[PDB]
Amino acid sequence: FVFEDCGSEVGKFSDIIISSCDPSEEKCSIIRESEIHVSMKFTPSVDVKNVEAKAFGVLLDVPVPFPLKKPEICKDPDSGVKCPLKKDVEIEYKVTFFVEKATPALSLEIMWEFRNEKDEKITCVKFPAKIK
Ligand SMILES: CCCCCCCC/C=C\CCCCCCCC(=O)O
Incomplete structure (x- = not known):
């Protein structure tokens, strides 16, 4: 899969690492x-x-x-x-963060953003996940 750029206007990201995948x-x-x-x-x-x-x-x-x-x-x-x-x-x-047992097992796209104080996007990361 790709950590896709979902649009940022005041920055960029170069690398995302998630320990479980x-x-x-x-x-x-x-x-x-x-x-x-x-x-x-x-x-x-x-x-x-x-x-x-x-x-x-x-x-x-x-x-x-x-x-x-x-x-x-x-x-x-x-x-x-x-x-x-x-x-x-x-x-x-x-x-x-710890993922609880009470967390439902599903597949979904996740979008994750960092914004500045002015509500402008520094980063926007989009990726598919499967909670399992
Ligand atoms: C309840 C399980 C949540 C599903 C896991 C989501 C996985 C996405 C991975 C990285 C992007 C999210 C980073 C935010 C970390 C949470 C810490 C916080 O609560 O502030």
């Missing part, structure tokens, strides 16, 4: 009852004062918004990212 697969396997480690290498094209992350699961061609626990990336002590972000400098975001 490899891009050689048809869909990204997300294992329940396990810790998932996610990394993104990205570069803002402008100086960024604050970052708010957004996630969506695609259903019926419509991206449905899903709540994140720590959307203010720069204020999360474990993210590895400190604001302000400098223009043209590649940095890396890190996050670990």
